[PDB]
Amino acid sequence: SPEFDCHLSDMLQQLHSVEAEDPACIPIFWVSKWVDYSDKYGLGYQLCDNSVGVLFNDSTRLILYNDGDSLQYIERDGTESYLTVSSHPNSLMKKITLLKYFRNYMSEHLLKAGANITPDELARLPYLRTWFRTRSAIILHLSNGSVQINFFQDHTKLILCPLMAAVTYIDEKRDFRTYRLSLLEEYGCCKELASRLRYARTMVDKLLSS
């Protein structure tokens, strides 16, 4: 279905037109940690529920649930299969090994982004659809429609949700604020948020046009 990307294009349209805070719009899922081993292996990530995923170079995906045992494997054509750490096909040994290596690295060394974001609506576990980097940021596109942008220089982050029509901004002080895009469109926002939303427009355009 091209509905998600159309919602994303609709959000892009809204961003072009952009007391606007609304806690009812707080995201349920975002990327809290990531490791870029894309030269040889792929991109590993942690979601805020402590689940870990990898988008491998061969365009396959392996997802470990936060129970630390359950695994979903998604083949290139979209075929989904389920397995566990203890019960798995031999062909998946290397990919499982790599996921556990990434999991250990992130757990040992890395900060959990949005650890202070306060947690009714059904939470459906997404996977990483695609990602790319610029000099200034990493852009992460989740299967639920959400687009996350992490800025390297000041550690500020944006979480863009097309379904909720909302944006969450994590500032340098690690304080989070969630805004309704319609309220930003109608009333405007600070230059701090405005400048990052301008860059986000370019990034989302890049994502959609590819």
Partner: peptide, 6 residues
């Protein structure tokens, strides 16, 4: 960087 904030 090759990883998120340490």
């Amino acid at each position: 960087p090759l990883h998120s904030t340490a």
